[PDB]
Amino acid sequence: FLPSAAYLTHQQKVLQLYKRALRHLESRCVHRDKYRYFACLLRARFDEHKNEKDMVKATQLLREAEKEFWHGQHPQPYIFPESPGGTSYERYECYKVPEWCLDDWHPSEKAMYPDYFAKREQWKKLRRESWEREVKQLQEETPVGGPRTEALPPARKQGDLPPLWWHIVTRPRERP
Amino acid sequence: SWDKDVYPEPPRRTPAPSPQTSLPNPITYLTKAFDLLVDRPVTLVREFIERQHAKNKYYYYHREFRRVPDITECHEKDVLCMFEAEMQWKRDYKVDQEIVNIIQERLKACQQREGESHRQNCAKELQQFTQVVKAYQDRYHDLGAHYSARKCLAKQKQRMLAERKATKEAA
Amino acid sequence: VVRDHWIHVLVPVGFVFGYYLDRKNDEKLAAFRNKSLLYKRELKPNEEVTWK
Amino acid sequence: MNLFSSLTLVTLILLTMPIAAINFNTHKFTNYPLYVKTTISCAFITSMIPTMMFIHTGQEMIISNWHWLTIQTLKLSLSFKMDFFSMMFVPVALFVTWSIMEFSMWYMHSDPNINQFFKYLLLFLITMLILVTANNLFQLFIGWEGVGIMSFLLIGWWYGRTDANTAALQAILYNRIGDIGFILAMAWFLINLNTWDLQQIFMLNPNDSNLPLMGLILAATGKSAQFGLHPWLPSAMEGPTPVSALLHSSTMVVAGIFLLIRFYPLTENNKFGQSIMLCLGAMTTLFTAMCALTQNDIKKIIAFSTSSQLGLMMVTIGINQPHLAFLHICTHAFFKAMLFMCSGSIIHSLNDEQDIRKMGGLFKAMPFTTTALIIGSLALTGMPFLTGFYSKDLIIESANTSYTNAWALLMTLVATSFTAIYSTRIIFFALLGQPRFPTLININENNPFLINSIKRLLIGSLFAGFIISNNIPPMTIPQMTMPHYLKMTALTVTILGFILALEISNTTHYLKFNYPSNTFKFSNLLGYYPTIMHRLTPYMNLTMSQKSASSLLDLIWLETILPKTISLAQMKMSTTITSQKGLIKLYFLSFLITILISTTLLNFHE
Amino acid sequence: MLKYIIPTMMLMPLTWLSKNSMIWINTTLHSLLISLTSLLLLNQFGDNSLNFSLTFFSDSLSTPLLILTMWLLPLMLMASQHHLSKENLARKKLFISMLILLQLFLIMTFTATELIFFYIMFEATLVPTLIIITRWGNQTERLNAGLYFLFYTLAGSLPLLVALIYIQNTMGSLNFLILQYWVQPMPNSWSNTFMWLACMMAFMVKMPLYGLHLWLPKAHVEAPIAGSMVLAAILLKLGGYGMMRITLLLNPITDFMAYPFIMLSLWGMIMTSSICLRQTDLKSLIAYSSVSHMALVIVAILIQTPWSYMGATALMIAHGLTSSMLFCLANSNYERVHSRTMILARGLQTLLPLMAAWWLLASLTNLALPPSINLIGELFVVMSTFSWSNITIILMGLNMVITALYSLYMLITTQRGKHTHHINNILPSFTRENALMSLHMLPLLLLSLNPKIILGPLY
Amino acid sequence: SHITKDMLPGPYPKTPEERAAAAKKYNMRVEDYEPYPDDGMGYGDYPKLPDRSQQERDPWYDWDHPDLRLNWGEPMHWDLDMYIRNRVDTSPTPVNWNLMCKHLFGFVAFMLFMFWVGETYPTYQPVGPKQYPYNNLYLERGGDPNKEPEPVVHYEI
């Protein structure tokens, strides 16, 4: 369930296991120095059988490693206050008013803010002028009838903006 | 105003506090300042408004009724007899509900005046409360929402006939 | 003021008409003028009426 | 009396003018926080005076006016009184909330929606004040559901954040179970004593007091975050910080047991009632005490701590000592308002990381908040003559010197040891250890409003416990005749708890990495009660809502039984009648057999 | 009462011979003047009712419902543009005149002296609503909804006429006083049981109770806002009004025969509050809410306590206001996004900052907020039913818990947490919609100050 | 403006045409399409999914609808109203489920058992009654001012 590929990798799965076990050992192990000791012990335990030339033995050790990890996890791991489940986790989703709005104002409030609305007008002209031919030709020129991936190509032909940029550039500041 | 014999009040009992030691007494200074800042101007305003009231003179009277005879003297159908009968009964019902309200307010006031000893000087009012409310429970209670007057007289006949059978068994 | 716009005068005059006709019905139903056993005083002071 | 009644009514009426200020605003203010803070200060400085007159003379009173729907034998007005509890509680709440106005000037300065916030919080104060002044029981119910719904809004302040509105939904659900308990008690009072009025109800003593007191127990264990309905309290901590401070330090959480403190002449009798009281209190006390161990957030530790304190107050109602429970309300209110406000100061100073892991080094990082935390988490246990001595230790003395349940005593004893050890662990992980918090630090307390608020509440929690707890008329018999090891036992248990927690701390200094043994899990996962019940009962009710209610009973079966069978009967009879090909011989044979069946079979000439 | 009948007639050719873009102002202004004149009625005192003829008379049950009808007319007549403002002048005038004629038959029905006249004006109220919801239903099953509405309400309501003719020619006339002052008990035979079942089952169809309630939600989700609000508020509370009047006869047999209807109403109140917790189609939640609250009303009518009748009429009026307003907010959100669903139109705390106050205040008047009239009604029904039996208060409080749950879920679903950021057509809130919200809420709070009006006959 | 044949009458049979139409219609893989089956509970031919799907779907994929975990073209499992975050969280638990309910019910049974053992075996300090002066404090009980003067006295010990 990832945008660029279908399966992660074997190495990617071992690597996610390593980051999750190291994070849970952070949360388990306070005072940071016994943490550093146990983290180097874990790094050594990965080093002792990292260089095995098989593949079914690699997935064997991976599967038993998930067993002996899920035995020893921590109930409330220290997740950061931006991660899902965290303390904040879009705390300031109260104030992410999107920018398809702000055009439905009365013109007196538009007369209070001259320069920002003039520059929004020139950005909106830049959106409307460079939408049809360039973006739709690059989106209906390079793909096959099945796209088979979600990475979209940059604009490297001659000039202007990359395709499908508007609701990725004009997103809110995430600390308004 | 109000009659002192329908909403009774016991006489006042108020001590004179003898201060042992001398700090003295912040609330006495504060209540004299309260008197001078609140009690005088509101009294002057009320006296002005009362003079403006007593320039002219309105009067409102109390509405009073007569005694239309009975429901026991009305016949089989006779709708222009039962009408006066049941409206007279319904006005008795309203004023009797307010009798119960007066007695229950007396019970509340006996609770709050007599303090943390409830059972001293509240036995008489609780006694008359249980008396009048025993009368109400006997007389108006178990008839429901579509009372007109006739279910009350049917309850009257049924209760006195049952007590007639009870005293015949007691004979 | 009337023939300038005559549309807003319609329902207040209709209500005045209905009020007049309710008073006319009340004058039509004027039996038992002083024949109730409760609301019955002698007629006074001037002329013949206690409600209309 | 003029001064007494007039000043109580202006303490109620000063908390209506800023609502008029926002309603008639029309040109938006900037000093509206300053306005709300100075009117709360004026409300406190007019609420000090009639309490002083109350202790100086006595002179309790009720006021009652503007009766509406005086329909049957009852009548109900806006009727509120000031007695011992009813005006010994109000200045404490106003004082606490004025300090929270200071701290919420500071903490919520950088969010531009501050005016609606102070509107909501002032309206919450108004509703809880209406709850603690009234004697008409319906007005108590008004204050009840009003503080329930303002608790809903202030928990769900941060829109977005599905944890917050999940929390608010859980809080309003357990408040409606408080409502079903309270309306059962109200129904029994109406039908058996013609009213809901505390004067008349206390005037009698109805002896069959089982159904109303069971309803009161259900309402109190709903509103006061207790066992069976407790786990909404850390979830309620998941909102903003001064919200949680006001909402679960002084107000909104004592309103469960304040009702039982009000109904002391009705719970004089009914030994079954007091047995239920103190069994429930001991269960809550041990359960949230053991659940408070191995918690790694600040606010959830403080929520489990205040749940244990309300457990001691239910024990205090189980033993016949209501006035000690009220004294514990007051001191507890000062104390944990100060504790929440100090933790909110630290959390906003340290970029809101908010957790006990990655929290450590804060002593000498300016030590005003560390002084606040050590005074607080000192005062939580029994410290021999501080504010937390008087209430809690008179509670355990009167609990030990009584005809008790003999296991509830042991539960309160063990949970006093547990509150000693999580107080020690919150001190040790919050202030003492090696500093574990990320660089580019801007730890800041050069700040007027923060130090003024913390200053005002430390001055509160040092003196006002004694000042309140000494000059009151003795409404009970103090015990005062204990043996040895029954008066000493409070300090004995707190000291052995400190030794136990300090040796656990020095084992945390070691390095062994022991595996958990599932009692760690049982104390760490909030208990298994939130996970088990919140995954069963939302799944069971809605699984029976989709199958039975949604698809099965209404739509599919009721649309087959009433429309479909009738419509199919009409369709089949029509397709049998009108499906006639046009041959005339069939029609005249029908005429002939009609004539014969009318003559000889079913007679019509006879 | 003729002073209220005849300007309702006179307000109809107003709409025809007013010119283009001037029918609106004249009809709104004159119906609001009719609302003031309607509020001048409230004279009713003490002993008797008031008689506005041998044809018209007003009990104190009929007074607040009549003022509710003549107050809900101009609110609706303003509420029903922007989904027919682009339509024709003739069809627009036909719609407005249809609402005026429906008001006329509702006034006919609420000031009905005779029960025969009450039945005729009952189904005369039934007539135009089918035409309204079918011609402007704006969905594809409006035919099915109007047809189920018609045949349910007739086929339940129809042997009521036969029972009323039988009472007409076995006891003389059917004035409510001479039906009263003469009514004799009717013993436990079987023909009396069928007469009771005919009358009470006709009104059971009209309320509805649980076994007959799929009548309603199609007629609300597949109907315009005018037919929806009039249908819910005035037609269901008119059915309750009718049961209140006709239950004065048949005094002894209701104790014998009125247990299973109490049962079906209670258990279906619980199941209906459960079914409106998990649905989509935002309009339908208020419909099943109305089914739950009128099942509570039915329990309140069939138990026969004065506390129960006061709580019943208070619950009727408060729920009529609340459910009509909440229908109107649902139509406002549907005009914002052409969805009718619930999980789509998310966000709306950030955008539309004022609409949150009306959603919250309507959801709290549906929550039974304690000074409001809704809790007054529900509280007296709970008091009376706990006097009925000591065990049935569990179902009442469980209804209370689930009612708070689904109402506040309906709040925090549509208008809490994240805009779906692909909507980008919603405009800021007009003055019209907020004027409608202020016309709904402010009479409810001003009755919450002084509810001695809306408590009915047994005040 | 919508096709009438994008709704869903009838169950799975027959196997080539209706399964091909449903797989093209629900934007699903052919072997991933599963009807319920047709036990007659309604349900049409709407697919069966792995039924939990909302505390999974790791939130760093950055799909369209952030607080719903949908992606505009998923078949939207039949019970989604019961499955949103803020309704039901079927996360993989840190312990178990059966072992959890066993420990909880055993602990609640133990606490209520010890409360019953307490309720049959109280504690008390070695102390007689509270001795009341005037006839077990008569005339400040329920009353009867002249009915029952009950002779009871206390003695100094």
Curated annotation (Swiss-Prot), chain D:
Species of provenance: Ovis aries (Sheep)
Membrane topology value: Multi-pass membrane protein
Localization in the cell: Mitochondrion inner membrane
Q: Which gene encodes it?
A: MT-ND5
Q: Give the highest taxon in the source lineage.
A: Eukaryota
The UniProt family comment states: Belongs to the complex I subunit 5 family.
Gene Ontology molecular functions: NADH dehydrogenase (ubiquinone) activity
Question: What is the recorded name of this protein?
Answer: NADH-ubiquinone oxidoreductase chain 5
Main localization category: mitochondrion
Give the record's subunit note.
Answer: Core subunit of respiratory chain NADH dehydrogenase (Complex I) which is composed of 45 different subunits.
| Function recorded in the entry | Core subunit of the mitochondrial membrane respiratory chain NADH dehydrogenase (Complex I) which catalyzes electron transfer from NADH through the respiratory chain, using ubiquinone as an electron acceptor. Essential for the catalytic activity and assembly of complex I.
Key words, A-Z: Electron transport, Membrane, Mitochondrion, Mitochondrion inner membrane, NAD, Respiratory chain, Translocase, Transmembrane, Transmembrane helix, Transport, Ubiquinone
Swiss-Prot record, chain E:
Query: Its GO biological process terms?
Result: electron transport coupled proton transport; mitochondrial electron transport, NADH to ubiquinone; mitochondrial respiratory chain complex I assembly
From the Swiss-Prot or TrEMBL record, state where the protein is found: Mitochondrion inner membrane
Tree of life domain: Eukaryota
Does the record carry Magnesium as a key word?
Answer: no
Keyword annotations for this protein? Electron transport, Membrane, Mitochondrion, Mitochondrion inner membrane, NAD, Respiratory chain, Translocase, Transmembrane, Transmembrane helix, Transport, Ubiquinone
EC class name:
translocase
Where are its TM segments located? 22-42, 60-80, 98-118, 147-167, 196-216, 224-244, 256-276, 284-303, 308-330, 351-371, 391-411
What is one GO cellular-component annotation here? Answer: mitochondrial inner membrane
Which molecular-function annotations from GO does this UniProt entry contain?
A: NADH dehydrogenase (ubiquinone) activity; ubiquinone binding
Membrane topology is:
Multi-pass membrane protein
| Catalytic activities | a ubiquinone + NADH + 5 H(+)(in) = a ubiquinol + NAD(+) + 4 H(+)(out)
Query: What EC number(s) would the UniProt record show?
Result: 7.1.1.2
Give a yes or no for keyword Transmembrane helix in this entry. Answer: yes
User: What exactly does this protein do?
Assistant: Core subunit of the mitochondrial membrane respiratory chain NADH dehydrogenase (Complex I) which catalyzes electron transfer from NADH through the respiratory chain, using ubiquinone as an electron acceptor. Essential for the catalytic activity and assembly of complex I.
Summarize subunit and interaction data from the UniProt record for this chain.
Core subunit of respiratory chain NADH dehydrogenase (Complex I) which is composed of 45 different subunits.
Q: Which family is it part of?
A: Belongs to the complex I subunit 4 family.
Q: What is this protein called?
A: NADH-ubiquinone oxidoreductase chain 4
Question: Which organism was this protein described from?
Answer: Ovis aries (Sheep)
